Amino acid sequence: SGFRKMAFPSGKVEGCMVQVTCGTTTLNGLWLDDVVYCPRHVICTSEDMLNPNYEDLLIRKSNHNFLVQAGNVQLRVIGHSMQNCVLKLKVDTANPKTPKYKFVRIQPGQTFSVLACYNGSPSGVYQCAMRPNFTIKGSFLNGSCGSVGFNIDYDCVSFCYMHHMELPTGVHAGTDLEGNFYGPFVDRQTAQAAGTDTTITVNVLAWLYAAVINGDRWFLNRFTTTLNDFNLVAMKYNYEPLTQDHVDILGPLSAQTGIAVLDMCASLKELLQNGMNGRTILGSALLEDEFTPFDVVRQCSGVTF
Amino acid sequence: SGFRKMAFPSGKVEGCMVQVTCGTTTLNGLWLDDVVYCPRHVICTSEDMLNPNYEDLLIRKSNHNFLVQAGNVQLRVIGHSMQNCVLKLKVDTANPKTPKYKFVRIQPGQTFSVLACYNGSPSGVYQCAMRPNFTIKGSFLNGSCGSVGFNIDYDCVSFCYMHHMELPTGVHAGTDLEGNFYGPFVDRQTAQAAGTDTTITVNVLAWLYAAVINGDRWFLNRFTTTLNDFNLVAMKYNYEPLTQDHVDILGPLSAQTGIAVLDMCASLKELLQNGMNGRTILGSALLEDEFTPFDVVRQCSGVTF
Numbered sequence: 001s002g003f004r005k006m007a008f009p010s011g012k013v014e015g016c017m018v019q020v021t022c023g024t025t026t027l028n029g030l031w032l033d034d035v036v037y038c039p040r041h042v043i044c045t046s047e048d049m050l051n052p053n054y055e056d057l058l059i060r061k062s063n064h065n066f067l068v069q070a071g072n073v074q075l076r077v078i079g080h081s082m083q084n085c086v087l088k089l090k091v092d093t094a095n096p097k098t099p100k101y102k103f104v105r106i107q108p109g110q111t112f113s114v115l116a117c118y119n120g121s122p123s124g125v126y127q128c129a130m131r132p133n134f135t136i137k138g139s140f141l142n143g144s145c146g147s148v149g150f151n152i153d154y155d156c157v158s159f160c161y162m163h164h165m166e167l168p169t170g171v172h173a174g175t176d177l178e179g180n181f182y183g184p185f186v187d188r189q190t191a192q193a194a195g196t197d198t199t200i201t202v203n204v205l206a207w208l209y210a211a212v213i214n215g216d217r218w219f220l221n222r223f224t225t226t227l228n229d230f231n232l233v234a235m236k237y238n239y240e241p242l243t244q245d246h247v248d249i250l251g252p253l254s255a256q257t258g259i260a261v262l263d264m265c266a267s268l269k270e271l272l273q274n275g276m277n278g279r280t281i282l283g284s285a286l287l288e289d290e291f292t293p294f295d296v297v298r299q300c301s302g303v304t305f
Numbered sequence: 306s307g308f309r310k311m312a313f314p315s316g317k318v319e320g321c322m323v324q325v326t327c328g329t330t331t332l333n334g335l336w337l338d339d340v341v342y343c344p345r346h347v348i349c350t351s352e353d354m355l356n357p358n359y360e361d362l363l364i365r366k367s368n369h370n371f372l373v374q375a376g377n378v379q380l381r382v383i384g385h386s387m388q389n390c391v392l393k394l395k396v397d398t399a400n401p402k403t404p405k406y407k408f409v410r411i412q413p414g415q416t417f418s419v420l421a422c423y424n425g426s427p428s429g430v431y432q433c434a435m436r437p438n439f440t441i442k443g444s445f446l447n448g449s450c451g452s453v454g455f456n457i458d459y460d461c462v463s464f465c466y467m468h469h470m471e472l473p474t475g476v477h478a479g480t481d482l483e484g485n486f487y488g489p490f491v492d493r494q495t496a497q498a499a500g501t502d503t504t505i506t507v508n509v510l511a512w513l514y515a516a517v518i519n520g521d522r523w524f525l526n527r528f529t530t531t532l533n534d535f536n537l538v539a540m541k542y543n544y545e546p547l548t549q550d551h552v553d554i555l556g557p558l559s560a561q562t563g564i565a566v567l568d569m570c571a572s573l574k575e576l577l578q579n580g581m582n583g584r585t586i587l588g589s590a591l592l593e594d595e596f597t598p599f600d601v602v603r604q605c606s607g608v609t610f
C-alpha cells in the first residue's frame with residue numbers, strides 16, 4: 001500500500017544525455033541513434049535572447065562549432081539542421097545505448113517524468129504534468145535546458161518534452177522533440193505571461209480513487225451529482241470541465257472501488273466548497289492533480305518496465 | 306527556479322536489480338559484485354510469516370532452491386548465508402554493471418530514493434525519509450520486497466534501505482543492507498505498531514529556506530526566537546527538538562539568504578500556531594519535512610552525478 005508521486009526509472013534516458021556547447025553556451029542534448037537534439041538557443045548569447053534571428057545566427061555556425069561530449073568522449077558532428085525550435089546535430093556514431101523510443105506530443109493534463117541534467121550529467125528525476133496553460137512546474141536552473149520529459153511503456157521511451165525557458169513567474173516552457181513549443185511560448189526573452197493555471201479535474205478524481213484504495217476515505221459522503229451540476233462548481237474553482245470522456249476513462253477505477261464516478265464528483269464538490277478542515281488525503285493538504293487515471297492504475301497494480 | 310521532490314537518477318541501481326524465487330515466493334534482490342542480497346523471508350510461506358524460525362526454515366534450502374534471474378538470464382548460486390534479516394546469495398558471475406557503492410545505515414531524518422521493483426523489474430522511483438519512528442512512507446505492493454533505497458554522491462551509490470514489511474497501518478519497515486531493521490520492527494506477521502510520527506524540524510526549516518530562494522516569502526515575519534522557546538512550541542506540535550547541531554547544518558542556507566536560523570524558526574513558530582490560512586508554500590498546503598538541508602543546497606545548486 002501507499003501512494004507516492006512516482007517517476008519512471010530514468011536509466012534508459014540517462015544513457016542518452018550529452019553535453020552540447022556552442023561558443024560560450026553549454027546545455028544538454030539528447031543522443032538517439034546518430035542524432036543529437038538540443039534547444040536552438042544554444043547558439044545564442046544572453047544578449048541575443050532579447051530578439052534573436054535564429055536563421056541568421058545559424059549562418060555563422062559550422063558543424064565543428066557544436067561541441068558534443070558524451071561523458072568524457074567527444075562526438076564528431078557531421079551535419080546540423082534546425083527543425084522549429086530544436087537543432088538536430090548529426091554525429092558519426094549511433095548511440096550504443098539508444099532504447100526503443102517514440103516522439104509524442106502530449107495533451108494538457110498528461111503527466112511525464114523529467115530527468116534534470118546539467119552539463120550532460122543527470123541530477124535528479126521527478127514527475128510533472130503539462131498544465132492546462134501549457135506550462136510545467138519543474139525544477140530547472142541555468143544549464144538545465146535540453147533536459148527532457150518522457151513516459152515509458154514497458155521498454156519503449158516516449159519523449160514528450162524538452163526544456164527551453166523559464167518565465168518571469170518561475171514556471172517553465174518547452175517543446176516536443178520536433179521543436180514545437182507547448183502553448184503560445186517562444187524562445188525569446190520577452191514579456192510572455194502564462195494563462196490561468198486551472199486544476200486538472202480528471203486527475204484529482206483519479207487521485208481520490210487512489211486514496212480510497214489506500215485507506216483514506218473520510219471524504220466520501222452520501223451525495224451524488226451530475227456532470228452539469230458539478231461543472232458549475234468546477235468553473236467557480238477554476239477546475240477544467242469534466243466531460244463524458246473523462247468519466248469513461250475513470251471507469252476502471254470506479255469498477256475496482258465500487259464508487260460511481262458521479263458519486264466521487266459529489267465528494268470532490270464538497271471538498272471544494274468546504275475545504276479540508278485541516279485534514280489530509282494521501283499526506284496532502286490540497287487536492288493533487290498530477291496523477292492521471294493511468295498513473296493510479298499503474299502504481300496501484302505494480303506495472304514494471 | 307522551482308523546487309520539486311526529486312529522486313536520484315536510478316540507472317546505476319536498475320542495473321543491480323534481479324528476481325529471486327524460493328519455492329512459491331518471488332521478490333527482488335540486489336546484485337553487487339558476485340553477491341545477491343534479498344530479504345530472508347523469501348524462504349517463508351504466508352503461513353510461516355506468523356511465527357517463522359528462519360534458522361530452521363533455512364536448513365531445508367540448498368543453493369539450487371534460490372532461483373535468481375537477471376532479466377532473461379539465470380544466475381548460478383554457489384553459496385548462501387543469512388546475515389541478520391537478509392540472505393546473501395553467492396553467484397558465480399560478478400554483476401558487470403556493479404557501480405561504485407557503499408552500505409550505509411542512515412539516521413532518522415535522512416532522505417533517500419527508492420527504486421520500486423516487481424519481479425526484478427523497476428517500476429518507479431520516488432523520494433523517502435527515514436521517519437523519527439523508523440518507518441518510511443513508501444509505495445509498496447506484494448512482490449516489492451527487496452526494493453532498495455539509496456543516495457548517490459557523484460558516482461558512488463550508498464545503499465541504505467531494503468524493503469521488508471508493511472505494517473497494518475499502511476507504513477513500511479525494512480533493513481539496512483547488513484540486514485538490521487531500522488527501529489524495533491521484525492520480519493514476522495505480528496502486532497507491531499509504529500510510534501509517534503514526529504515532524505523533522507530541521508528539514509522543514511531547510512524547505513522554508515528553499516521557498517525563500519524560489520520566491521515564496523509571504524511567511525517571513527518580523528519576529529525571532531530562541532532554541533529553547535521554539536522547542537516549547539515544537540513539543541506541542543510533535544516536532545523534533547531543534548539542536549545547535551541542526552542550527553549549524555543550516556548555516557550555509559542562512560548565509561545564502563541572509564535570514565538568521567532563529568528568525569526562520571520564528572516564521573515556523575507562527576506557521577504552526579496560526580496555520581497556513583489557505584495559502585501555499587512551494588505548492589504545498591502543509592509543512593514539508595522530507596528535504597534535508599543538503600537536499601536543498603543540492604537542488605538549488607545543480608549538482609550532478
Ligand SMILES: Cc1ccc(N2CCN(CC[C@@H]3NC(=O)c4ccccc43)CC2)cc1C
Nearest residue numbers: 209213252253256257296297300301446447
Ligand atoms: C495482502 C494483499 C496483497 C495484494 C492485494 N491485491 C493485489 C492486486 N490489486 C489490484 C488493484 C489495482 N488497483 C486499481 O485501482 C486497479 C484498477 C484496474 C485494475 C487493477 C487495479 C488489488 C489488491 C490485496 C491484499 C490484501
Ligand SMILES: Cc1ccc(N2CCN(CC[C@@H]3NC(=O)c4ccccc43)CC2)cc1C
Nearest residue numbers: 141142514518557558561562601602605606
Ligand atoms: C538567471 C540566473 C542564473 C543563476 C543564478 N544563481 C546561480 C547559483 N545559485 C547558487 C545558490 C545555491 N542555493 C543555495 O541555497 C545555496 C547554498 C550554498 C551554496 C550554494 C547555493 C544562485 C542563483 C541567478 C540568476 C538570476
Ligand SMILES: [Cl-]
Nearest residue numbers: 285286590591
Ligand atoms: Cl499539501
